[PDB]
Amino acid sequence: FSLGLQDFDLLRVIGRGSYAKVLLVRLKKTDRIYAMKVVKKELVNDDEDIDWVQTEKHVFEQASNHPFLVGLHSCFQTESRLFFVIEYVNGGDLMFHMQRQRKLPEEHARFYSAEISLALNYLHERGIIYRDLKLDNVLLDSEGHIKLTDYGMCKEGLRPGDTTSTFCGTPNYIAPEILRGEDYGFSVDWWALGVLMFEMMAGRSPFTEDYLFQVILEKQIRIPRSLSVKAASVLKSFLNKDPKERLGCHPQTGFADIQGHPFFRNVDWDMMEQKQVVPPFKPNISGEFGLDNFDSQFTNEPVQLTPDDDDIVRKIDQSEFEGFEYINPLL
Ligand SMILES: Nc1ncnc2c1ncn2[C@@H]1O[C@H](COP(=O)(O)OP(=O)(O)CP(=O)(O)O)[C@@H](O)[C@H]1O
């Protein structure tokens, strides 16, 4: 019935994180290619692990169809591993891009932040706080549009006006209200976007973790002299330390406030969401599979899954993973 590992060819290793090894794969007997995230079950032990995997799967399902999120093809498992077969996104990522470009013109940062805003707003309308926005979690597709990735840290199930309390995120991007221990909502995503926009336009972060948190909480953010009034305003508005006054966070009008901000005046949001706006940069894409923009650290790895150690695998609590199988109800 459900797909399994033996329905795919492994083509290349393309990435690694703390939970997953990511490969380019191809559905046998077809030309259809996917990314495949492989998570060893021996890494899923705590409630934090279980929730991470469950959340990633549930958000992957919500993300299918939306242009700026990564779609889910299928989930399946072997005795030792969990597998997510997902949209293959091969334009690189914004961290990669910033390492090469160093600093983006305001028009470029506008384009990326507009698409990220549309992605965030869709997640928020579905009750999801993203909580993991950072340069290397914004992928570029082959044409140069953005896709948000890495969904395990999301909070899902937030009815409008709900808040949550978990201390999490990447330190450089964690919002003041999280650092203050307040319950929070979607405001933390708009703070992170502020930080990311600062990084794009200034070429540096606006800021030990202890000292970094103190800087986030107390230090005044200075806008580079060379940025326009509109950029200064959009950055200071997103980086307001009070979530009640922050851009995008005003009740009822938040997203309209972003769309109406002078920084975004030259944005046709309807065309933007239909991918009818020309990206300002076209990623390098060559050859049969366009592996140009992945670190050779991974594309040089041998294309294989590490052999199972029976002494470990026999101890896995397989009941924890019943029902993992999934196939996209759109094929
Ligand atoms: N849909 C996709 N298409 C192409 N490459 C992808 C991809 N999803 C992930 N990758 C690559 O794999 C790398 C690791 O994936 P990811 O960061 O999601 O790992 P992870 O699930 O272990 C969570 P984390 O990295 O935050 O610890 C990414 O940095 C990216 O380069």
Numbering used by the authors: 247 to 453, 466 to 589
From the publication, what sentences describe this entry?
Atypical protein kinase C (aPKC) is a key apical-basal polarity determinant and Par complex component. The atypical protein kinase C (aPKC in Drosophila or PKCι/PKCζ isozymes in mammals), its binding partner Par6, and the small guanosine triphosphatase Cdc42 are three essential determinants of apical membrane identity in both Drosophila and mammals (Fletcher et al., 2012, Harris and Tepass, 2008, Hutterer et al., 2004, Izumi et al., 1998, Joberty et al., 2000, Lin et al., 2000, Wodarz et al., 2000). aPKC isoforms PKCι and PKCζ have regulatory regions distinct from those of other PKC isozymes, but share a conserved catalytic protein kinase domain. Like many protein kinases, activation of aPKC requires activation-loop phosphorylation and an αC-helix conformation compatible with Lys-Glu salt-bridge formation to bind ATP and serve to align residues within the R spine (Kornev et al., 2008).
We captured an active mature PKCι conformation bound to the ATP analog 5′-(β,γ-adenylyl methylene)diphosphonate (AMPPCP) at 1.8 Å. This analog was resistant to hydrolysis compared with AMPPNP. This interaction stabilizes Y265PKCι side-chain stacking with a rotamer of W298PKCι from the αC helix. Other PKC isoform structures have a phenylalanine and cysteine, respectively, at these positions (Grodsky et al., 2006, Leonard et al., 2011, Xu et al., 2004).
